[PDB]
Design a protein around this ligand. Structure first.
Ligand SMILES: *[C@@H]1O[C@H](CO)[C@@H](O)[C@H](O)[C@H]1NC(C)=O
Lengths: 49, 49
């Protein structure tokens, strides 16, 4: 996920393109909603995979 | 103007627990695939038809 962004993305028409690769190995819903409210407030991330 | 018990039922719905939403009688709560375990005790407006 880190190597897919560096040498690729040559035709980048937006400017606020930044990838965030995180690993939540355990998926209890309290921590999941915590990560949602942390990433959505984290400089307006528009991608949730 | 939300009138949505959907975040409570979906927060308790990652464990797939039935949540009784008793706010309104909308037909969008009557779907089986959108609302898997959301079993209410109120009928939709199709019973008025
Ligand atoms: C999640 O698991 C991987 C190994 O599969 C580990 O490398 C990583 O540090 C873990 N994430 C955490 C706890 O930061």
């Amino acid at each position: 996920l880190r190597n897919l962004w560096g040498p690729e993305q040559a035709t980048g028409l937006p400017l606020d393109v930044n990838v965030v690769a995180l690993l939540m190995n355990r998926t209890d819903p309290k921590s999941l909603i915590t990560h949602v409210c942390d990433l959505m407030s984290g400089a307006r991330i528009h991608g949730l995979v | 103007d939300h009138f949505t018990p959907t975040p409570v039922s979906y927060t308790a719905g990652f464990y797939r627990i039935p949540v009784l939403g008793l706010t309104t009688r909308m037909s969008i709560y009557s779907d089986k695939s959108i609302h898997l375990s959301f079993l209410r005790t109120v009928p939709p407006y199709s019973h008025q038809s």
